[PDB]
Design a protein around this motif. Structure first.
Motif, PDB file in Angstrom:
ATOM      1  N   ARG A  29      86.631  30.077  -5.306  1.00 60.06           N
ATOM      2  CA  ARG A  29      86.036  29.024  -4.478  1.00 60.06           C
ATOM      3  C   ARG A  29      86.408  29.194  -3.005  1.00 60.06           C
ATOM      4  O   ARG A  29      85.644  28.808  -2.132  1.00 60.06           O
ATOM      5  CB  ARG A  29      86.452  27.642  -4.963  1.00 60.06           C
ATOM      6  CG  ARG A  29      85.805  27.253  -6.232  1.00 60.06           C
ATOM      7  CD  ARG A  29      86.135  25.810  -6.535  1.00 60.06           C
ATOM      8  NE  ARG A  29      85.500  25.379  -7.770  1.00 60.06           N
ATOM      9  CZ  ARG A  29      84.427  24.608  -7.828  1.00 60.06           C
ATOM     10  NH1 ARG A  29      83.868  24.163  -6.718  1.00 60.06           N
ATOM     11  NH2 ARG A  29      83.876  24.328  -8.997  1.00 60.06           N
ATOM     12  N   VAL A  32      83.936  31.721  -1.675  1.00 62.65           N
ATOM     13  CA  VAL A  32      82.568  31.221  -1.615  1.00 62.65           C
ATOM     14  C   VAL A  32      82.341  30.212  -0.502  1.00 62.65           C
ATOM     15  O   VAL A  32      81.442  30.396   0.325  1.00 62.65           O
ATOM     16  CB  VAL A  32      82.163  30.586  -2.946  1.00 62.65           C
ATOM     17  CG1 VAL A  32      80.782  29.946  -2.821  1.00 62.65           C
ATOM     18  CG2 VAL A  32      82.167  31.632  -4.035  1.00 62.65           C
ATOM     19  N   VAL A  33      83.170  29.164  -0.479  1.00 61.34           N
ATOM     20  CA  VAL A  33      83.078  28.071   0.498  1.00 61.34           C
ATOM     21  C   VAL A  33      83.414  28.454   1.936  1.00 61.34           C
ATOM     22  O   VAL A  33      82.871  27.888   2.867  1.00 61.34           O
ATOM     23  CB  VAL A  33      83.957  26.868   0.082  1.00 61.34           C
ATOM     24  CG1 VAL A  33      83.642  25.651   0.948  1.00 61.34           C
ATOM     25  CG2 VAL A  33      83.747  26.560  -1.387  1.00 61.34           C
ATOM     26  N   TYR A  34      84.287  29.434   2.115  1.00 62.29           N
ATOM     27  CA  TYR A  34      84.687  29.892   3.450  1.00 62.29           C
ATOM     28  C   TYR A  34      84.550  31.412   3.433  1.00 62.29           C
ATOM     29  O   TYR A  34      85.543  32.134   3.536  1.00 62.29           O
ATOM     30  CB  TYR A  34      86.142  29.484   3.721  1.00 62.29           C
ATOM     31  CG  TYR A  34      86.430  28.015   3.452  1.00 62.29           C
ATOM     32  CD1 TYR A  34      85.963  27.024   4.315  1.00 62.29           C
ATOM     33  CD2 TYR A  34      87.137  27.624   2.329  1.00 62.29           C
ATOM     34  CE1 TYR A  34      86.194  25.697   4.069  1.00 62.29           C
ATOM     35  CE2 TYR A  34      87.373  26.298   2.079  1.00 62.29           C
ATOM     36  CZ  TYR A  34      86.901  25.349   2.944  1.00 62.29           C
ATOM     37  OH  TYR A  34      87.148  24.003   2.698  1.00 62.29           O
ATOM     38  N   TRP A  36      84.156  33.872   5.453  1.00 55.60           N
ATOM     39  CA  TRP A  36      84.829  34.817   6.342  1.00 55.60           C
ATOM     40  C   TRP A  36      86.120  35.356   5.690  1.00 55.60           C
ATOM     41  O   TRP A  36      86.621  36.408   6.073  1.00 55.60           O
ATOM     42  CB  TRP A  36      85.114  34.203   7.727  1.00 55.60           C
ATOM     43  CG  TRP A  36      85.957  32.977   7.703  1.00 55.60           C
ATOM     44  CD1 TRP A  36      87.311  32.920   7.741  1.00 55.60           C
ATOM     45  CD2 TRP A  36      85.499  31.614   7.586  1.00 55.60           C
ATOM     46  NE1 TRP A  36      87.741  31.629   7.654  1.00 55.60           N
ATOM     47  CE2 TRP A  36      86.642  30.806   7.554  1.00 55.60           C
ATOM     48  CE3 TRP A  36      84.230  31.013   7.509  1.00 55.60           C
ATOM     49  CZ2 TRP A  36      86.580  29.416   7.447  1.00 55.60           C
ATOM     50  CZ3 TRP A  36      84.161  29.633   7.408  1.00 55.60           C
ATOM     51  CH2 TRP A  36      85.304  28.849   7.372  1.00 55.60           C
ATOM     52  N   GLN A  38      86.355  36.718   2.947  1.00 55.35           N
ATOM     53  CA  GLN A  38      86.007  37.889   2.161  1.00 55.35           C
ATOM     54  C   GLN A  38      86.375  39.215   2.820  1.00 55.35           C
ATOM     55  O   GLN A  38      86.657  40.180   2.120  1.00 55.35           O
ATOM     56  CB  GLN A  38      84.515  37.892   1.842  1.00 55.35           C
ATOM     57  CG  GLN A  38      84.062  36.751   0.963  1.00 55.35           C
ATOM     58  CD  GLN A  38      82.576  36.818   0.714  1.00 55.35           C
ATOM     59  OE1 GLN A  38      81.937  37.837   0.997  1.00 55.35           O
ATOM     60  NE2 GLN A  38      82.005  35.737   0.197  1.00 55.35           N
ATOM     61  N   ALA A  50      77.919  33.825  -5.659  1.00 54.97           N
ATOM     62  CA  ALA A  50      78.941  32.913  -6.144  1.00 54.97           C
ATOM     63  C   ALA A  50      79.299  33.369  -7.554  1.00 54.97           C
ATOM     64  O   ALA A  50      80.471  33.379  -7.942  1.00 54.97           O
ATOM     65  CB  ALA A  50      78.417  31.472  -6.170  1.00 54.97           C
ATOM     66  N   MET A  54      82.981  34.538  -8.821  1.00 59.11           N
ATOM     67  CA  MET A  54      83.613  33.812  -9.921  1.00 59.11           C
ATOM     68  C   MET A  54      83.883  34.660 -11.150  1.00 59.11           C
ATOM     69  O   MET A  54      84.825  34.383 -11.908  1.00 59.11           O
ATOM     70  CB  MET A  54      82.783  32.593 -10.323  1.00 59.11           C
ATOM     71  CG  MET A  54      82.584  31.565  -9.221  1.00 59.11           C
ATOM     72  SD  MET A  54      84.101  30.900  -8.433  1.00 59.11           S
ATOM     73  CE  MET A  54      83.868  31.534  -6.962  1.00 59.11           C
ATOM     74  N   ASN A 107      93.980  23.398   0.351  1.00 55.50           N
ATOM     75  CA  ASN A 107      93.006  22.331   0.159  1.00 55.50           C
ATOM     76  C   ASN A 107      92.031  22.647  -0.964  1.00 55.50           C
ATOM     77  O   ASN A 107      91.642  21.762  -1.719  1.00 55.50           O
ATOM     78  CB  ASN A 107      92.259  22.020   1.447  1.00 55.50           C
ATOM     79  CG  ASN A 107      93.057  21.121   2.388  1.00 55.50           C
ATOM     80  OD1 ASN A 107      94.001  20.426   1.979  1.00 55.50           O
ATOM     81  ND2 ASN A 107      92.652  21.101   3.650  1.00 55.50           N
ATOM     82  N   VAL A 108      91.656  23.909  -1.099  1.00 57.04           N
ATOM     83  CA  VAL A 108      90.755  24.292  -2.175  1.00 57.04           C
ATOM     84  C   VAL A 108      91.441  24.109  -3.532  1.00 57.04           C
ATOM     85  O   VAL A 108      90.791  23.709  -4.505  1.00 57.04           O
ATOM     86  CB  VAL A 108      90.225  25.718  -1.991  1.00 57.04           C
ATOM     87  CG1 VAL A 108      89.519  26.197  -3.226  1.00 57.04           C
ATOM     88  CG2 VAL A 108      89.266  25.719  -0.837  1.00 57.04           C
ATOM     89  N   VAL A 110      93.703  21.776  -4.234  1.00 55.11           N
ATOM     90  CA  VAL A 110      93.719  20.348  -4.517  1.00 55.11           C
ATOM     91  C   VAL A 110      92.373  19.952  -5.128  1.00 55.11           C
ATOM     92  O   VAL A 110      92.332  19.182  -6.087  1.00 55.11           O
ATOM     93  CB  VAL A 110      94.050  19.526  -3.236  1.00 55.11           C
ATOM     94  CG1 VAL A 110      93.908  18.044  -3.476  1.00 55.11           C
ATOM     95  CG2 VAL A 110      95.473  19.835  -2.793  1.00 55.11           C
ATOM     96  N   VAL A 111      91.280  20.514  -4.607  1.00 58.19           N
ATOM     97  CA  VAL A 111      89.946  20.227  -5.131  1.00 58.19           C
ATOM     98  C   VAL A 111      89.833  20.762  -6.553  1.00 58.19           C
ATOM     99  O   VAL A 111      89.361  20.070  -7.439  1.00 58.19           O
ATOM    100  CB  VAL A 111      88.834  20.819  -4.232  1.00 58.19           C
ATOM    101  CG1 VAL A 111      87.513  20.856  -4.979  1.00 58.19           C
ATOM    102  CG2 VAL A 111      88.677  19.980  -2.947  1.00 58.19           C
ATOM    103  N   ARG A 115      89.162  18.685 -10.087  1.00 55.79           N
ATOM    104  CA  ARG A 115      88.003  18.983 -10.927  1.00 55.79           C
ATOM    105  C   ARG A 115      88.415  19.164 -12.366  1.00 55.79           C
ATOM    106  O   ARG A 115      87.766  18.656 -13.276  1.00 55.79           O
ATOM    107  CB  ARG A 115      87.250  20.240 -10.443  1.00 55.79           C
ATOM    108  CG  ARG A 115      85.777  20.268 -10.889  1.00 55.79           C
ATOM    109  CD  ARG A 115      85.089  21.616 -10.643  1.00 55.79           C
ATOM    110  NE  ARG A 115      85.627  22.650 -11.515  1.00 55.79           N
ATOM    111  CZ  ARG A 115      85.489  22.661 -12.836  1.00 55.79           C
ATOM    112  NH1 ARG A 115      84.816  21.701 -13.463  1.00 55.79           N
ATOM    113  NH2 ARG A 115      86.097  23.595 -13.541  1.00 55.79           N
TER     114      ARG A 115
END
Ligand code: HEM
Ligand code: HEM
Ligand code: HEM
Ligand code: HEM
Lengths: 145, 141, 145, 141
Positions: A29, A32-34, A36, A38, A50, A54, A107-108, A110-111, A115
């Motif tokens: 994640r 994918v979400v951020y 840069w 990569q 994605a 994953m 932070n990712v 914590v998400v 979930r």
């Protein structure tokens, strides 16, 4: 850095965390979400979708190591700096990752925890985790300032 | 800026939220105050303790602003104008705080919509909330 | 911090700095360019326009005050985390200023120093001053963890 | 989009730069490399020594794109589309770096245009470089 009862609340919940699953989901994640982030994993293979990220074996395998590093930090909640001093040299002087990214990964995570755990990840419990996350991020960053 | 795929994921996810919007707006705020205490200084007139009727009411208002933005994704500047004037000109909210609320919202959503909260959705929602943040931040760049 | 050659270059340059002026210009610009910062200084009266801010008496006075802290940190360049310990807790625990803003003021000061010295503010001398600014910002922020 | 007053200030400022734009863009790069060494990480194929013809050359190209962005202030997303894709999709430049380059630009401008770099011009240029940054990191945020 937190009180002893918080420390116990956190370490207790960390027991129910499947590091194989959560770790790979979090790193994936992050990528994918951020996007840069990569450029640091260009050798991990195909990160074009994605679904590719994953399902990438190097991502899943690497995500587990990060969380082991995280499990390690749980056990050293005071001297977070000394624990991550070897990683701080790796990320700061060798890879040259900006400190802001350690915060995004935290932070990712914590998400990802929210979930996977649902209502068990209460607001007050998240608050404590948000403290260990900044701790890890700050320690990881001390070889830069 | 939101692509068509993003607009599609944001509309799909908010549709799942439905009538739970107000509730999630309250939970997101509670998480924000607990996780990042500094944000409480913006609400000296609220009782920030758990279950306060002021937090529920306010979360319901935040959830309503977001529903409006979701219906007007192509014209966020026109749809959130009044609020931009309020948060930027009047309140003077430090733009760092918007990142903190967005993170709290994402956390709230993740825990109530785990099946729907996929990596691509997380990424679109993240872009939507940042675009919304940029608009309330409009009176200053 | 800084190497001894850096410290000497920085120290000598500072000798020509009219802190009473530069300070007022730095804080005023911080308030004009990054508007939310005015939230903390509503007590200074009128800040509604660029000129009201720049010509505001308390702004020029508080600026002089902020710069004096800087001159003082310049004499304790090896113990920055100690010199600003009290100032850190004030800004953090009693004023509630996000640490990101310490970096913004720091950068505004560099731009002000650049506008007032032109040619003399060389790329290398600025690199040296960026180091100090980063150090001071980090010292002011250590009470957030 | 910047306000008409802002657009006015950017254009007035870039006019005074005139036939120095390439010298200033190259200087902004030297200052960014010296002040923030991490940025060197993106140019491992460059000779980064003081006076490098590579740095000079690239600074000319950077200044060229800023000039084009100024002459197209009412459509930044359109004018820098090719540049947006290079920086965001192929180079994967971390957004943090745009703030460092913007800052080095403002310092360069401030030292060469003392009287023209008024507080209002400063604020207008900052918004402009922020808009440009926002555009260049669009394939992602
Ligand atoms: C804040 C949480 C982080 C932790 C605890 C963490 C943990 C780790 C660990 C355990 C390793 C393995 C070192 C070894 O045994 O050789 C590592 C490697 C690495 N990390 Fe991190 N990391 C973090 C954040 C980041 C971020 C944000 C990035 C970049 C966007 C990053 C980039 C890398 C890269 C490129 C590697 C080397 C992978 C390879 O071997 O090719 N890390 N990290
Ligand atoms: C996506 C982000 C946000 C949305 C959509 C949002 C939405 C709203 C709405 C709908 C209102 C009520 C306006 C009215 O009816 O008068 C409001 C008020 C307010 N907001 Fe936000 N807001 C956002 C972010 C923030 C953040 C990050 C802060 C600061 C931590 C903030 C602080 C305030 C304050 C202090 C008020 C006034 C409360 C009162 O006096 O009752 N907002 N917001
Ligand atoms: C990074 C450099 C900074 C330094 C070295 C610094 C230093 C100081 C000093 C020494 C004082 C006490 C002055 C006195 O005794 O009267 C002060 C007060 C204050 N500072 Fe800062 N400061 C910095 C950043 C900030 C920032 C970025 C803000 C937030 C926008 C801020 C807001 C304030 C406020 C509101 C006060 C209290 C004003 C008063 O007592 O009237 N400071 N600062
Ligand atoms: C103000 C924002 C910036 C502008 C206007 C800008 C403009 C340019 C231009 C005109 C080019 C040449 C493109 C071409 O030849 O087609 C370029 C390439 C490139 N930029 Fe930027 N850029 C900006 C920010 C950044 C940032 C912040 C970094 C990271 C430190 C960066 C890294 C690069 C790299 C590595 C290249 C390719 C160099 C090469 O291999 O020739 N740029 N940029």
């Amino acid at each position: 850095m937190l009180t002893a009862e918080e420390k116990a609340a956190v370490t207790a919940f960390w027991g129910k965390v499947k590091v194989d699953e959560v770790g790979g989901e979090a790193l994936g994640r992050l990528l994918v979400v951020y996007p840069w982030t990569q450029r640091f994993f260009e050798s991990f293979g195909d990160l074009s979708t994605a679904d590719a990220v994953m399902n990438n074996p190097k991502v899943k395998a690497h995500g587990k190591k990060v969380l082991d590093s995280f499990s390690n930090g749980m056990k050293h909640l005071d001297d977070l700096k000394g624990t991550f001093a070897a990683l701080s040299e790796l990320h700061c002087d060798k890879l040259h990752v900006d400190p802001e990214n350690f915060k995004l990964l935290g932070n990712v995570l914590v998400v990802v925890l929210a979930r996977n755990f649902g209502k068990e990840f209460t607001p007050v419990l998240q608050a404590d985790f948000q403290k260990v996350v900044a701790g890890v991020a700050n320690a990881l960053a001390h070889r830069y300032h | 800026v939101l692509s068509a795929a993003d607009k599609g994921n944001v509309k799909a996810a908010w549709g799942k939220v439905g009538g739970h919007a107000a509730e999630y707006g309250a939970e997101a705020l509670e998480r924000m105050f607990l996780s990042f205490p500094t944000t409480k200084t913006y609400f000296p007139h609220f009782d920030l303790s758990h279950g306060s009727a002021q937090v529920k009411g306010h979360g319901a208002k935040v959830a309503a602003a977001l529903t409006k933005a979701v219906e007007h994704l192509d014209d966020l500047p026109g749809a959130l104008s009044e609020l931009s004037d309020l948060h930027a000109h009047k309140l003077r909210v430090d733009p760092v705080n918007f990142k903190l609320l967005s993170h709290s919202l994402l956390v709230t959503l993740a825990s109530h919509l785990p099946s729907d909260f996929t990596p691509a959705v997380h990424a679109s929602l993240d872009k939507f909330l940042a675009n919304v943040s940029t608009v309330l931040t409009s009176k200053y760049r």
